[PDB]
Design a protein around this ligand. Sequence first.
Ligand SMILES: [Zn+2]
Lengths: 195, 49, 175, 98, 1111
Amino acid sequence: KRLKVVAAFQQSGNSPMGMVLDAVPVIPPELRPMVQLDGGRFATSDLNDLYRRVINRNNRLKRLIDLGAPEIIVNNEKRMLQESVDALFDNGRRGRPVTGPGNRPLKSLSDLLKGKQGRFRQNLLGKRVDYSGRSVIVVGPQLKLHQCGLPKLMALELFKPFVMKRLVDLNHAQNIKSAKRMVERQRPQVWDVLE
Amino acid sequence: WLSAASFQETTRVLTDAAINCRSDKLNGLKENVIIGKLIPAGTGINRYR
Amino acid sequence: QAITRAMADQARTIRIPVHMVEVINKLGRIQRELLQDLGREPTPEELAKEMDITPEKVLEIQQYAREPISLDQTIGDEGDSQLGDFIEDSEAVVAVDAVSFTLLQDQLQSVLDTLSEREAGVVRLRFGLTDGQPRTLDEIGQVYGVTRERIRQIESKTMSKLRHPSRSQVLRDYL
Amino acid sequence: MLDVNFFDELRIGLATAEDIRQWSYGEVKKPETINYRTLKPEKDGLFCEKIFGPTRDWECYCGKYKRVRFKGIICERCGVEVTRAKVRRERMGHIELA
Amino acid sequence: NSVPGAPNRVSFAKLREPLEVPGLLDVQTDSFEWLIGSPRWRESAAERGDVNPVGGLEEVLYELSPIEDFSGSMSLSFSDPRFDDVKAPVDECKDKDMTYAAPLFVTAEFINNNTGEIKSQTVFMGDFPMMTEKGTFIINGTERVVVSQLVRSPGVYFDETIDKSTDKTLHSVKVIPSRGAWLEFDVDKRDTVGVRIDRKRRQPVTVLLKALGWTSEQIVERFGFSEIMRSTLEKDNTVGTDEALLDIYRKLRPGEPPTKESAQTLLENLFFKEKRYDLARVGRYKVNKKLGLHVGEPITSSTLTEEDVVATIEYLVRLHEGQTTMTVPGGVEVPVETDDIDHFGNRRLRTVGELIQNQIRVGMSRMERVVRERMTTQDVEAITPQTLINIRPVVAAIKEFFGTSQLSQFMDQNNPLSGLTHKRRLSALGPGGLSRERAGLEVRDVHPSHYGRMCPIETPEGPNIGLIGSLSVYARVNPFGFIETPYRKVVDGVVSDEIVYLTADEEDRHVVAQANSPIDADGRFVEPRVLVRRKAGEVEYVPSSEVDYMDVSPRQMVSVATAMIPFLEHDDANRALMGANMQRQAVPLVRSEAPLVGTGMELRAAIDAGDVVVAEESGVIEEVSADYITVMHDNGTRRTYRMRKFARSNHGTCANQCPIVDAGDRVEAGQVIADGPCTDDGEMALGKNLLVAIMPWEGHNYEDAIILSNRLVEEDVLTSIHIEEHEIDARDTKLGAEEITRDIPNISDEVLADLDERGIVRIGAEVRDGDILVGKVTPKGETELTPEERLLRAIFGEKAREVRDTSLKVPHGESGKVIGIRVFSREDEDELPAGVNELVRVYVAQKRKISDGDKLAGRHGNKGVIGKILPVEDMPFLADGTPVDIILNTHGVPRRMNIGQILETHLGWCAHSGWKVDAAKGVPDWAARLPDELLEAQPNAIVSTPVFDGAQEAELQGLLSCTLPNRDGDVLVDADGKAMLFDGRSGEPFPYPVTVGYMYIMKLHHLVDDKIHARSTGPYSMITQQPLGGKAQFGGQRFGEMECWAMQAYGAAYTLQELLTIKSDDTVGRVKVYEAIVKGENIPEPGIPESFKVLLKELQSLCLNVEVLSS
Ligand SMILES: [Zn+2]
């Protein structure tokens, strides 16, 4: 058992210093955006909250140390820093999850990766696509094998730029923007050209 | 490690992936899928490409 | 005291000064008491009296009392999607504008070049489109060796002949 | 790191302090994100514009340079590099532990 | 019959009812009544358990009073939970978005125990929300429904398991009090006991009994024969009462120093104090019955005691010893039988009352916290009841319950049924409920203890199959809330009219008998061997005189929506589920034909639904009008009824209430005043009655595709009105305010044609998709004015137009006339929140004439979207020259056990043509036990058929004999059933006779006008550049991994690179392809996408350096 790790580190140019930590990354703020909803109401990713907790922990630990305090309180603060970084990397690993407002668990980095919600199985293994649509189906007996019925409006809003251009070079709309408004208003000309 | 970590126990496997300096070949099928590169199957192999 | 200051200035996701959060807490106190003192929620037009501050200040106080929310909390009846899933990146390129912006910029060359080249260059720096600095007519005198009033004359020579619909008919589709 | 999609081998490994502070564009030391009035990041706040770069495209903290003609220039008052707002996605920061 | 306005709906009933059908709103009504202190409940409680007529209000008030201080010198006590009148009527609160409610008041008692002072301060508690007669609470105006829940009655539930090592049968118990920490006693792999308390496995009962103040003495006075515990006291390895106490402490309060009294008093504070371990009152009662401890006493002291636990341990051990009667020394005996859960005897029913009083319990828990907080920091004699009480935690507690607690969900309303049957819902999920993934296979099952209690058929067919339940019809709500079902009891072969309510555990000491036997009316059974249910739920034969209980009557174990399917007994229980659930999804049409063939419950089930206006009081009909109907009571006064027309439903439909009354006719207490959206003559009517021929028509009704008679479309026989509202909210801003007028930036002429000046459409504006509905014009903001547009505004002469028009355009695929506007405003001096100066609700309706893709369905699960509808030209006709109503596919019928809809088909044929079963010389053999007046019928008639006690197959065979036609001489269905048809296309006959007859059909709320989404390119996600999800937002389609699998299996790599790179996530390429097919050029080489780069940022952000080597 201990071989599989000690040898792996021996061969690898990897120092088990990194397995203990003294500096922490800060993911780019947009990836943890502090975004405002329509009309002042905001929204955070709660990662900013974990960073807040760790920042305050370290700040007060310094304040004690910079001042020089009784030991046991410093021991408590140091454990608190351990806990805060633990949550940051993994909420809910040791002891209870770090629940926030209204008694709900928060989200940590290690959560962003797991299961049908983590990036792998939620946003890299499967993703949402433009130029697409969905509608109910009906039987298409009057078709041939290769042929498939298509709600014309669905086809239009699928084939939007194509019809845009095609009538633009038929000059039914001078420039592309005129054609965009044409399609939006759904003038008759867009239909034959859709065909 | 990328394929397995993109299969199950995302963290546990990622641990030893990090430990063992496992450089992924960036060549596997599911690899190409994630990285947005063309997969090595069907019309993706260099012979057809 | 330490807990008061620490909560006031460090327990807020968005740190607020002691005075503003102080009035906010005073509001949460006096209004919450006034609810029972009134048999009803105390109205803001009334709450503004007790602080002897204008109602608009009271409402700013309240609008700073409301706090940010979390982007990942479940929204569906079951847990299948988060709030962050409904948010739009405001910085998205419409990608019709971009193509149409290129078309604007190209119709610009096609129209300027069909105009005189002296004038085309005059405007290219007057509005400073190809550069970062729009220019005044006395900078143009060096580059074009003529009195600034002559560029005052040329600006209208551009615009009015442009104001012939021939240039306008092909450009009015660009809005 | 420039990523023109010419990739051969993806490496995963532990990161040291000399790596984390190597990636960062400063150290963040103040637990703040938003100004409740100016709605801006603070000096070394969790969204510090200086650290992660500008939000307003080609417009620094004081907007000493609000034009793309200034590009890459680091303002002499705030130090916010004048560049694209995309870096706030690209750049990252760090905290040093006591 | 037994109804003041019902028509004659003759049926084939076999027996009479010892009791009629109960009020079908008795799930919310009684619960809330008992919650309040209603005078009805005041008398009912003072006669059915008057030891404590106490609503949740009074009850919680008393469990809370009297709050003391840390010392006991000063205290506060409560009394008089008093109500007040509501703040406005139902629609008014809904009209102006207010929570229907009434104020509450209470009289405090500020008792300074030190010396004695009193303040009987009548403290305002807030505005407590109140219940409407329909049980539907209004929140902020919105209608919401509190669904009933099932839960575990707290206590000790003894269980058995295998060790699968020596195959020993081991026994344990879950000591389960409401608000209790776990303590687990069992016999382990060995014969010792595991006494692990709160999941900490050491210290068997030696730490337990000795720590009670005991030593081995009292223990061995009980455990000399208990070998399971003799070893424990022999493996004591320690001595001491306080020693066992500290061992608890070492295993229940470790991590903190002990002391000789800290555990010595902690073990009292844990279970023998009432502030951390308190099983419910009915829980105390349940155990009283389980172990037999208490047998004549009222309930108090939810805090755990000592007598119970000794009985518990001895029951566990004598079960491990496989005994038959454990009797803890000092009381009555009880048998040795394992404690089931899923048998309703242990599954109680937490209704609205319990939920609300519990939320109030916790609200006043925090209120007591604040009372004590302000009882100390505030000076003595400087404190009054008002200052002690923070009622915020009270009002919050309810509102946080009401708001955003899935036990208080949206009121669903697209038909009267979805209004009703949404109540009387017995949910399994929630706080105290079990989550779906935790909800295993067994719990989903239909326990034998559901008979009569829960509907065994009407369950959701999604992932909640078996979890969410619905009430029966005849069921009852217990004061405790344990399910109660009325039944007759056969005593010595005397099935009594006695309506004896029992729950499940009240069967295991009883025996329920067959429901429809040759009962001579003497109360005996003709045959000894009758199919009864034995105590364990076993259903077998038992002699006539031996069983003790008989059922009340058929359609007792069934719900209402299920009770609207004629021939349920001929329909697969599977498909019956589909039909019942679809009956909740019908859409409000404009006729609502009553079924020619239905069930007698429909008439009852409609008036009880409130969706039918009633003559609450008898007296003459003064007058009839479309806006009101005045019933002049015989005594001076009248009753004016103001009707509800074009009031949008909770699911965007109408609540139309048409009158079927006469200007002078006497109306009775309980007779219709107006039919509702899906009712006629006061019985439910969700659809229409249509002649059939299930011949498959040229592959357009193939595989669940349906073809209809186009008359029905041109007639709009099956067509639905669809109201909708777009909400337009203009708020306060630093840009200014979004002044809704007809000040439109850059607007043409034809687009203002049907618009009124005041910023909206003309009320009654025919509008369409994308049509501008409301001009919510906003200021635009800052931007660099492009030089081209600068030249334009210099060249043609238009203004900057610096206003951002955030108007409403009808989003994709909506249209129809505009109803009107509901506008509230700040200048109107209204209660708009801080900023919103205009709240607008414009209303657009469209009567969506049906089309293919719209989901229709019958009453037996037969369902599907319309494949096609051709004109009447090619419609085969009977020997009456008649093209038929409806044509379906046959192949669904054989493979789905669903000839039942054909059974109703044919009987509806008979009910449409009439019959006269010829009693020429004697009643025909079928006609004999076939009830009377079923020998007679005239064309175009209406009937019913009970779910299990209906028109048997042979009876129907007798209904075909006399097949007297409607008009011509045409007996088309022979005595055996089939009819003949001639094709309407060919004019040429089919080889075999073709089926016909009358089917009920209805339109389902799954329109292809609602379920289409298209997108070339909309907006994109926040973090990733990926699109969003939803039809509301332009959204975008999801391409999953499981699609990627086949996607590669095709080998189509380039298309997959397309999918994940540019079709999702490459910005510049997305513009490139825009550039490609705005340049009319082939889409060129793919780019490299953003979310992939966002993937990289995510990964780099993971405290691990990563660099892909090019080389
Ligand atoms: Zn600057």
